[PDB]
Design a protein around this ligand. Structure first.
Ligand SMILES: CC(=O)N[C@@H]1[C@@H](O)[C@H](O[C@@H]2O[C@H](CO[C@]3(C(=O)O)C[C@H](O)[C@@H](NC(C)=O)[C@H]([C@H](O)[C@H](O)CO)O3)[C@H](O)[C@H](O)[C@H]2O)[C@@H](CO)O[C@H]1O
Ligand SMILES: CC(=O)N[C@@H]1[C@@H](O)[C@H](O[C@@H]2O[C@H](CO[C@]3(C(=O)O)C[C@H](O)[C@@H](NC(C)=O)[C@H]([C@H](O)[C@H](O)CO)O3)[C@H](O)[C@H](O)[C@H]2O)[C@@H](CO)O[C@H]1O
Lengths: 99, 237, 49, 290, 30, 290, 237, 237, 30
């Protein structure tokens, strides 16, 4: 079910359920990040996994994140989607997150 | 393999070839009502090819500030063809549906369509305690437009609407959605003029966008009733 | 990079999904913090009339 | 394929994949969820997973006894009280929609078939204090639309065929199981239509899904002093079959008659912002500071 | 334990571990 | 070698030993306890020892129901009371550290896995006397960190999914079993670290080892007079597995948040003198006078 | 069949789907050092998923007057992740490599990338008798740029560099090259800070060209060390 | 037989020959985490000889008014060698320990060392209600000094600390203690930077005494992690 | 006796007479 990754102001209603990516002129650039505690409020809360989990306190198990690209057929590009196990801060550069 | 699709019902046929592997709602195919679930004891009419055939609705213009479109079943079809005549001449109704939603554009267009069939889409009104009236709910063949599709016009969520039987029309990948709906009611049959078992919702999650020549992009809904039964024959209502 | 031609829209969207896998488990059932009330709802008094 | 699941699935160990052919990349547009296993995404170990799944059973998820009705009334002499007041008795059309914790849990489904275990807690407060009377109460189950009593000493309380339960305040709470009563095989938690043949009926309300009426009086004649008697009704669904799950309610409920929505004024759970806001999509809300 | 004559009177039935999540996760045909 | 022990061991008779070779003299420095038997030290008789060992079973040693919480509050009208006061309800984060008899017994181990049998005794006293009201109380189990009610008539008391127990003062005490709840296989009785990823978290406190919250209200509306209502919570650990025994607490406990120590001012149980003093090492403290 | 490709190593995965059938260098797959070829007698650490995983470098901007890019292995990875820590704490090193070079553009872009892995690319300097210094050769993660890629910066030839393990990224056909390198040394293991067994060279034989909207086209290099061995554990150098 | 002892782990070896028969904590030897107790599903790195090897700490001066020394594990080793790098690059950690404590003196010296490994040594502070902070607990390789070792700095007792896995260094008998610690946690693995499973405590129960030439007598702690596992590979923290 | 459906609900289990004191009294190897 759809993550509300664009939980920002000016993103109004349905705009919150998509992340707009643009052409960039610098390499290795961060596009978005997602906080991962399904028991908390954030992009995962109003999901089917999020809402049922918040009837519970304890949770185990793997999650899957599926991203659908919704540009045109002619749109090309490569992304890297990194999961970082906890410990320190959220990685802000690509060479830190791909570890 | 998943793209090529051929849909022949009655005298109607649809070849979609940019499809994405059709949705059978809850893994259930439409059937006739069996004798161990039947209630109404008169012999039903099962018109077969007279009703079990694709009914194309009026197309809607997919536009930049569009919110969404909904059609309620059987209400969108209760006045069309021999399905509408069997609806108007019988008290009881039972069928499944084959919904085929069609929207193509160029390879330079972007846009995603959540095409979702909602069972018992009890619509809420916004910013009032008064329930929606008959005219707000029973739109017929024209259908309605979503007011706040982000909460699916019922205070819930677009984001979790993938729990319902759905496909997507991502203009990159495909140009057609195909949902096969069975009978979805607490009762075996139903009075088709006061109750809607399914609501086809079609929602712009990603809006239509391009920088090529702006054409009218339509969304065309073809609905085939499947395994129609009609009990309680009388005069036309 | 997101690399589009001139007649594609230069900004493209990603829809993100999340599910749980089948190794997923939930324990210790609690009331949901996602719904709440501080009043009675409208027409709830009409159930007593 | 339908199967019996008592524990969460085991993880099998996996190795390095470098293959030209079969795919972590699925087809969203089919409406199918990703079947990508963690064995196919990362290099895994063997985990024998012994985590039970019984607490998310729909029977366990819904067979919590939840407050469905909470009615206070004056237990006193009602010779000179208003015609609105509960004059030592109230009636209540049984609904699951007045209290939002049970309402959102039951509205996670389109269809529910359950027996309703009804528990009735009665508390009494003196309106100076002389002690609390061990009062007898009558809770009479009346069907939807049927005749309910109009006074405290009504002859409708005789219960020739209506089920009544008599219970005392000093007793444990009164407890009855109401069966699955619907004329249909399930209750419609949501009803997309009118349950009447004219076009003036109520939308969203099928009286087939109404359990019935709790008509609750105090059997005792009034005391010389007044008492406030609060009756709390608890419903535990049981022998539950649930069909067609739905998106949960996100916006605050406005009414019990419908699914009308307003949202809160700001995020979270606003009309145009369900999740609380962060500054940007690359802002991490609870970033660990080191 | 149930000493009532109606079967609906019984305690809750927390014993049905049959799952078919594929009717919601894979409602596709091919 | 692990073995089943139901009685203390028998003594075998022994004779005179005069042997040049195998040893009453062991090796302390290995960390091993002396294995010297009384048969090898003195000349013994045969004793068939029938003394049971069941009362020092860890299950019996710890499955005593012990006072863990004791909260008095005013049951009255709280229109004009301070914002510190329990206004007909209290919440309590369940701990085993507030009462030192249970605390020292549980802190005899490093790890404990037990189900918590929770018994709730309620006593009431009038704040002139007119009798004691048979009040209904609600004890609602709330998880660690979850939402607890903020007033007496809060809509969080509806308990859609929280477990609540309703009980009367005239009844026997309310009794619930809380399961072994930890996300780990045991509770950490001692936690040598921080349970947070930043360096500002609390030392010694792992919230995994917190059972949860008891939110205890009076369900009744207030009476015209005030009452003092004392709620005592009792916990009996059961189905107990215990790991890694520890030195017992010698110094008096200072806090429940930590293992801080002060000692008493003088022996016994002082910082520099745990055992009470005698005059010299050759002074016998309770020498028999003849 | 040749286009679809899935590369899972450790916690890293790459799905390329406009690929062109990956190159195994000299038909040789990376292995651990067997006992009949082993020299160093201490038990090596084989960190497996801690090091045998894709390391993405910084992307380079494919531009109109670009000459080429080179990265030397293991030197481009000697300070990255747990591979770099095992490099810095051990005297000896042996691994293979899985190099995955990524560059896409539109269907209106033209351009060919010779993506070639050169064994023992002893670089020559231009117009001098002085050998290249340490700073000219050991660039690390940033890599270097070809000065005269037509002679491969060693007085030979770009034209005959297809004798080395290579693929092409022709923007018509594919968007990714994949070369699998084994251990390529005269010695069984090696000191990874003073010797480079492989040089990944990426060269614009046909330059980037289009008449559509000019976007930054990057070339992204992901390198997975394969079958890492490390002997001679000591302090970090 | 009990005195002679040979401890080879990785490239590290220790021959102690005035030992006193090594302590295996609770009769338990370190093992890797089996599949029926495992939680984290990624394949762990088990660096073997890169981490399972003796790490010698800084020696402490055994002096006349000494109270005691403590080191917390894994915190004393979280920044040392390839163990520290695997700690800093992984979220999860699991190992056992082989602790070898070394202290010799002459045959004219007297002194007893309680060398005790305390599981979950939650330290209390003295004469305050404030819990010890991060800087009081997480000393790292330097370790800490006991404030009141008679109550083990937690209001309990030195006298009953023989319930924990311990040996003695009585300068008459032996010059080395050897404790083998398994994994000692309620969880299968752990985040090694915020939790200490074991505290090695070394306490002067009988002080150092002699009437011969006064030499610096040191206490040297060598700790070998045993059966290291590391899950959750990422960047260095 | 236990008429509850959860096994943790049962009375205390005062029946485990297995002892291994040698893991505390003889934690030595030779
Ligand atoms: C309690 C704590 O540790 N910190 C509080 C912050 O979390 C809070 O910041 C706000 O937090 C909000 C949390 O979102 C929910 C939630 O609790 O999960 C989302 C729920 O759906 C919502 N429930 C309902 C019925 O609407 C719930 C509710 O609004 C709150 O409990 C009401 O207080 O909130 C949310 O993310 C906000 O956007 C965020 O600002 C701060 C206030 O800034 O207070 C801290 O005490
Ligand atoms: C009761 C009796 O027959 N004789 C009393 C003497 O015993 C007492 O002399 C003092 O006795 C003290 C006893 O030690 C303990 C104990 O009762 O075992 C040690 C306990 O750990 C300690 N408990 C705590 C929580 O600290 C306990 C406690 O301090 C006392 O109960 C407090 O009164 O004491 C100890 O040996 C003293 O050093 C010794 O002087 C004399 C007083 O001189 O009173 C007699 O009635």
């Amino acid at each position: 079910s759809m993550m509300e990754i664009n939980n920002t102001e000016s993103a109004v209603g349905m705009e919150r359920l998509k992340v707009d990516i643009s052409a960039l002129t610098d390499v290795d650039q961060l596009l978005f990040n997602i906080p991962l505690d399904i028991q908390l409020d954030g992009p995962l809360r109003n999901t089917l996994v999020g809402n049922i989990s918040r009837y519970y306190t304890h949770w185990s198990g793997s999650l899957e994140m599926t991203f659908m690209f919704c540009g045109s057929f002619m749109a090309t590009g490569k992304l890297i989607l990194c999961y970082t196990p906890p410990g320190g801060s959220c990685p802000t550069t690509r060479e830190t997150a791909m570890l | 393999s998943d793209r090529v699709l051929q849909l022949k019902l009655g005298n109607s046929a649809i070849v979609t070839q940019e499809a994405a592997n059709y949705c059978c709602a809850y893994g259930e195919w439409p059937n006739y009502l069996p004798d161990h679930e039947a209630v109404a004891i008169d012999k039903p009419t099962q018109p077969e090819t007279a009703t079990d055939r694709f009914y194309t609705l009026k197309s809607v213009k997919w536009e930049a500030g569009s919110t969404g479109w909904w059609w309620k079943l059987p209400d969108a079809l209760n006045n069309i063809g021999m399905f509408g005549q069997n609806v108007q001449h019988h008290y009881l109704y039972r069928s499944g549906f084959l919904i085929h939603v069609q929207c193509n554009a160029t390879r330079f267009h972007q846009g995603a369509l959540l095409v979702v069939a909602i069972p018992e889409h009890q619509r809420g009104a916004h910013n009032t305690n008064t329930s929606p009236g008959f005219d707000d709910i029973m739109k017929g063949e024209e259908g309605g437009t979503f007011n706040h599709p982000y909460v699916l016009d019922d205070g819930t969520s677009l984001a979790c609407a993938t729990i319902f039987p759905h496909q997507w029309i991502n203009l990159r990948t495909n140009n057609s959605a195909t949902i096969v709906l069975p009978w979805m009611n607490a009762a075996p049959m139903d009075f088709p003029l006061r109750h809607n078992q399914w609501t086809l919702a079609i929602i712009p999650v990603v809006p239509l966008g391009t920088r090529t020549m702006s054409s009218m992009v339509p969304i065309t809904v073809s609905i085939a009733p499947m395994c129609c039964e009609f009990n309680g024959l009388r005069h036309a209502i | 990079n997101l690399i589009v031609p001139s007649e594609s829209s230069d900004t493209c969207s990603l829809i993100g999904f999340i599910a749980a896998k089948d190794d997923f488990s939930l324990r210790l059932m609690r009331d949901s913090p996602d719904i709440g009330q501080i009043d009675h709802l409208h027409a709830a008094e009409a159930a007593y009339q | 394929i339908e199967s019996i699941i008592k524990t969460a699935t085991d993880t099998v160990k996996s190795e390095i994949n470098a293959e030209l052919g079969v795919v972590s990349l699925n087809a969203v547009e089919t409406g199918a969820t990703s079947n990508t296993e963690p064995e196919e995404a990362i290099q895994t170990r063997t985990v024998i997973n012994q985590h039970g799944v019984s607490e998310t059973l729909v029977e366990n998820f819904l067979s919590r006894a939840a407050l469905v009705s909470k009615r206070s009334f004056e237990y006193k002499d009602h010779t000179s009280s208003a015609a609105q007041t509960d004059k030592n008795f109230f009636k209540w059309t049984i609904n699951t929609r007045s209290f939002v914790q049970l309402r959102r849990k039951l509205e996670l489904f389109t269809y529910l078939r359950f027996d309703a275990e009804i528990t009735i807690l009665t508390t009494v407060a003196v309106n100076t204090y002389m002690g609390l009377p061990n009062l007898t109460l009558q809770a009479m189950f009346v069907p939807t639309g049927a005749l309910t009593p109009e006074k405290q000493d009504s002859f409708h309380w005789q219960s020739g065929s209506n089920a009544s339960v008599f219970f005392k305040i000093s007793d444990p709470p009164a407890r009855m199981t109401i069966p699955f009563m619907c004329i249909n095989s399930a209750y419609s938690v949501f009803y997309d239509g009118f349950a009447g043949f004219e076009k003036s009926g109520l939308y969203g309300i099928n009286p087939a899904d109404t359990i019935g009426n709790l008509c609750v009086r105090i059997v005792n004649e009034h005391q010389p002093v007044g008492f406030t008697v609060t009756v709390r009704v608890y419903m535990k669904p049981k022998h539950i079959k649930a069909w067609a799950p739905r998106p949960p309610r996100t916006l605050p409920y406005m009414s019990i008659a419908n699914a009308n929505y307003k949202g809160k004024k700001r995020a979270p759970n606003a009309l145009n912002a369900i999740i609380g806001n962060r500054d940007s999509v690359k802002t991490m809300p609870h970033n660990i500071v080191t | 334990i149930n000493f009532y004559k109606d079967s609906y009177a019984a305690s809750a039935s927390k014993q049905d571990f049959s799952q078919d999540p594929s009717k919601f996760t894979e409602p596709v045909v091919e």
